[PDB]
Symmetry: D2
């Protein structure tokens, strides 16, 4: 018989399920950044990639496979068929349409909704017990959409939300203070992006409230213009998009961080997008970022942050906006 | 005074040199793959990025910076000016021209040589004691060019060479055997790419020579066509380029692996491109991949692999080709 | 209500089964070396400790728990009762007695057998699907004992075996060559310790057979005395026992390496102790180290090393020794 | 010539200075816990061990060396002579005596002082530019002693201090809240151990002050007895000492955490023991733990925590205690 059979005696033909499997749907720059970050943090024993562009998908898959010598994830697979995604613990959706010239925002949102209508049922068929982590924008709306289509309980449908926005905030805060972002604490809540809410009262280093040291923190009156930090959380994303065309690395790392908490059941707290009806004064079925405890069953718990009247009003405004958009969408 | 000054008492204003600094020149897909792989393996305390496209460079830099919370490399910098590269231990060149329609190979090679004529003197000015790791293709020729321009001793000028080719080989070998590539041993030497030489005699698992088990290994007569494995080492690269347009992930991981050996002085053995005159029968100043011991002073030693007459002839043919191309190039 | 309930809204009131649980039985120096190594490679989401000495057990557990901030293993538990071990994927046995005044080694072996008669049934009750990794000495005999008491198929009963011995060999080989042990290839097979067999023909760097370069490799007359390398594999262990009283760190790291391959399903090849009847000429039910493919279902495959007549005779001699001891033991 | 010379061509005949060297003085349980933690986080390219007990020292060194295959620290050395420590970036002192029958704690403190009188001059001769990290107890006093004997500026003399105490606090807080210690924020300052000060006002999750939610936090009358958390920070250490005889693992991990910040220049904030005269109302030359920014030049900056009158009084009391002990010690 063969060289293989001369070299190797096989006892065991038992099938084996993947035990720590992650799927990434959508292998654009964001999806691949998520994939490489996950691979290099050894979060999965199997990584599955899905796209509709078959050549891109296969080529990306093969490129990762060629680096297997340098990795500790023994199985990397891909396909347009969702059977490759079977038995995933965690499925990350980074699939999206490209805005065309002369296309409205609303049309693009609806094109992304329609992509989700095809993706989510297929994911659910093959991984009924998975957690869904939604990265695709508009992320708060598409997390709601994924929830409604999947039929999953709300603990298993999580939007990356303001995890990245909060990471940018801690980055910017660290630059101003000369401290590593790990030691700089501050929370951006609500909607990902423009309408995000910096919670000034929780901003601290070593448990020291910046707001109590500096009462003008977060106001227009501030000599030091600390509001500019939050403004830059928003503008820095626009800046990266202008300079290189898109963002990928930061979101990839942030998603790997959330994945770590889920896959290893860490019960760390992250600002992610969750079904917030009945809390913080919100009365409609919408997803907004608040600090959530993440582990193996998704969101098990959330932190009830004390907001100023102004902060709360901004969240309710966001919720009204999201409800309005949600009802003018089609499904 | 300021909130910073209220929060933080500064004692120490001493300047501080970077102690474990790496530079990547050329932030295309390869350069960025190298950067992310290095960042996620904590190989540097400072990463510097250089390109000629200022917007791309800045946007990439900012995108990595936004993920700082998730990293243990506290300083990421960039610029077109090489003063940002000062005091690097290791400088990785991934800078390259794009082939235009109707452009010869030779013209492209010369365009890459001319890029090196601008890069290498600038690198050397600011990091005279660095190791140079050349990734740009044609890698064997451009490693020779970097050596000649830099004036560095040959131990400090290293071409990524067949490190990636050998990684692909061990990947493919592992697929055939059902074993992790880490446990599958085999060496591809000589030129990166088409003319690479698989050394059949060193192919083993657990110290068991495949050639001794299967004497037809590497021949045309082989029922099992193990030559196809090496053919696929070549074709798989062309395949990835066809499918996704380029390769990035595998090379990025392979470069991070070489960087690990250098930065941590591991004295591991890797198939990299080194000045091979006077060895394996070669009589001209050319760079080819052989197994080299890598650490803090670059290539300190190399392994003398016993080659068949045929293997040796293929290397000498390669050396003659490289010498011929080298003399028809301009510097 | 409580501060917890004021801070935290609970979504989900669920039990939570451990997904990547490892148990260490025996928290002496070897057990705790295994524990810390596993904790610092993030191989488990839950670690369970068992001993008969309650105070030591509890104190060790608490000491690890106090380092939780610095680890990514969210649940560390301990008890005398094996219910704390329930649903382990991997159970590592490092439990044993200490040789008393006037006690033969064989008397001690029987006391260790009797320890296993208490441990193994308890482990099996609470983790019927686990892999068993036996570390306690005499390791080859006690792996057989664990197999017989457990009733487990042979893929799921693994002795740490010569993984450590082979690591020592590659260390010593690296000292002689000035190369990292990772790049120095060589296998020690058979029994852990004194009777271990160095396979000279597999010794290589970069696929270059040392035996072919140096035909006297492994002979007594060798100018360079390379047999001393294997002798030192044995004597170095006795040396550490003499100088420090025991060994712990190297075995801890070796066991973490095996655990990595199992928990991450890597299908790497390791020289571990497996039920070898019917292979390598062995005709009795014994455990000896040969190169095995390790993954999530334990030992899936064996590499068939080509041995000299003498190497094979040494394995069969070992098998006859183990069979003789196994028959004169009481169970 | 030799098999080495047949296998390997030497390019470069150079000495090689260590670039990222760490020394551990005192290879008891705490020293070796520090060593293994540092080795498994790849913080050093060379580790040097020192003790006065030669056999134990050599045996421990050899045991680590046998695990080299599984590590990425290529050089591990040991000796009684401090020439093995030359050119260390970081030197960690874990050396100490054991309390004898009829011996006061103060008598023991003086014996530990006398140990430092021998150690520190020797460390300084061979690594005049190192940072000193003092772990030996009484840690605050012995950090002062190391400072006085060394003549080093205060940025380069660091006591492990309350980094461990704060880790215990966050562990216990996490047990009460059902959240990972990483997401539970809270500071223990002042002296390591009994007299440590919990700063109630900094206790938070997600920037939410527990003190503001629960005003009785830190009072004796508290319904929920949150003072018990701090009491347990102290008692849990006594508990581990009572149950196991000593503590090692948590301190090992805490020291590796400090070492990480220094070796990688992270500028994270840690509660470590620093020369605090002129701050927090302290008027004598003593070392107490406050939140310090740690990097490659040791302590670069201090965070100025807003303390209650009572918290500040407790620090000053500690300073008066330390000053009194320091004056009645002989050197
Ligand atoms: N939540 C956050 O913080 C951020 C999220 N994003 C979002 O991530 C999304 C992806 O971003 P990029 O990679 O830059 O976009 P991209 O357009 O490069 O990639 C999208 C990918 O989705 C795939 N796709 C489209 N329809 C599909 C379907 N039915 N099934 C599977 N795949 C499908 C495309 O074929 C394409 O490869 C975008 O919506 C972007 O806004 C971007 C950065 C931050
Ligand atoms: N040795 C190996 O195993 C392999 C090496 N490669 C090589 O890596 C090179 C880079 O590959 P890609 O990122 O795909 O190409 P790319 O064209 O996307 O990026 C090249 C980058 O170099 C920059 N550049 C050009 N001139 C420069 C200058 N004077 N200074 C600084 N930067 C300059 C460009 O501006 C551009 O961002 C190519 O030559 C490619 O063949 C690709 C994969 C494997
Ligand atoms: N396979 C290999 O390469 C190596 C194996 N070893 C073996 O590891 C074993 C443990 O070594 P050490 O930690 O040095 O010895 P140790 O005597 O310090 O620790 C053994 C522990 O076993 C526990 N124990 C005894 N009976 C038990 C029971 N019924 N249930 C649970 N725990 C029980 C003891 O109470 C004790 O805490 C020994 O047999 C030693 O020879 C150590 C060196 C390397
Ligand atoms: N800062 C903190 O949070 C903690 C500090 N510790 C302290 O760590 C110290 C060491 O603890 P253990 O390992 O349990 O004690 P140990 O007594 O087992 O180890 C101490 C080692 O110091 C060595 N030694 C004594 N004199 C020396 C000299 N002149 N030169 C070099 N080495 C010398 C001994 O020979 C011995 O091997 C103790 O003072 C202990 O209290 C331990 C717990 C936590
Ligand atoms: N709360 S919500 O679901 O209704 C919602 C509405 C609108 C947006 C805007 C938006 C879109 C977006 C793309 C496509 C659409 F069809 C609609 C919105 N993408 N996107 C990106 N962010 C990043 C990054 O790196 O942070 C890169 S792109 C952003 C944020 C913008 C950079 C500040 C976000 C958002 F969550
Ligand atoms: N010994 S040498 O220096 O003279 C030399 C000559 C020719 C080539 C061909 C070549 C070029 C190349 C690009 C530009 C030029 F101007 C000339 C050659 N790139 N390149 C890539 N490799 C990869 C990858 O992932 O392996 C991606 S692209 C390849 C190899 C091809 C895929 C098999 C390589 C080589 F080393
Ligand atoms: N094939 S077998 O199962 O029948 C068998 C028989 C005898 C021994 C001898 C033995 C014992 C031993 C302890 C207790 C007994 F009751 C019997 C034997 N322990 N032990 C240790 N090794 C280490 C280390 O670090 O390598 C530390 S201790 C050794 C190996 C010796 C140092 C080289 C090993 C062995 F596998
Ligand atoms: N501020 S100071 O420098 O003056 C000072 C004085 C007294 C002590 C008490 C002390 C001693 C001690 C050992 C020997 C002496 F000679 C004096 C004191 N050790 N030690 C340990 N801690 C641990 C652990 O794991 O936390 C293990 S032992 C402790 C703390 C106690 C368990 C909570 C600490 C302290 F920092």
């Amino acid at each position: 018989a063969t060289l293989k059979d001369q070299l190797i005696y096989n006892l065991l033909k038992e099938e084996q399920t993947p035990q720590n499997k992650i799927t990434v749907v959508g292998v654009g720059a964001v999806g691949m950044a998520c994939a490489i970050s996950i691979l290099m943090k050894d979060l999965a024993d199997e990584l599955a990639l899905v796209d509709v562009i078959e050549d891109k998908l296969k080529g990306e898959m093969m490129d990762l496979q060629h680096g297997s010598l340098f990795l500790r994830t023994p199985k990397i697979v891909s396909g347009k068929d969702y059977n490759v995604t079977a038995n995933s613990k965690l499925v990350i959706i980074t699939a999206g349409a490209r805005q065309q010239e002369g296309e409205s925002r609303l049309n693009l949102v609806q094109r992304n909704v329609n992509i989700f209508k095809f993706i989510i049922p297929n994911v659910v068929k093959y991984s009924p017990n998975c957690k869904l982590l939604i990265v695709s924008n508009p992320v708060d709306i598409l997390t709601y959409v994924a929830w409604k289509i999947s039929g999953f309980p709300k603990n298993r449908v999580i939007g990356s939300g303001c995890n990245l926005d909060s990471a940018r905030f801690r980055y910017l805060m660290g630059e101003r203070l000369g401290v590593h972002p790990l030691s700089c604490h501050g929370w951006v809540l609500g909607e990902h992006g423009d309408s995000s809410v910096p919670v000034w009262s929780g901003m601290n280093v070593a448990g020291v409230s910046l707001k109590t040291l500096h009462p003008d923190l977060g106001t227009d009156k501030d000599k030091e213009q600390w509001k500019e930090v939050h403004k830059q959380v928003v503008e820095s994303a626009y800046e990266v998009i202008k300079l290189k065309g898109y963002t990928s690395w930061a979101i990839g790392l942030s998603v790997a961080d959330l994945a770590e908490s889920i896959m290893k059941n860490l019960r760390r707290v992250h600002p992610v997008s969750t079904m917030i009806k009945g809390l913080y004064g919100i009365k409609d079925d919408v997803f907004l970022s608040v600090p959530c405890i993440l582990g193996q069953n998704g969101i098990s718990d959330l932190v009830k942050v004390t907001l100023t009247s102004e902060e709360e009003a901004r969240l309710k405004k966001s919720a009204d906006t999201l409800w309005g958009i949600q009802k003018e969408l089609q499904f």
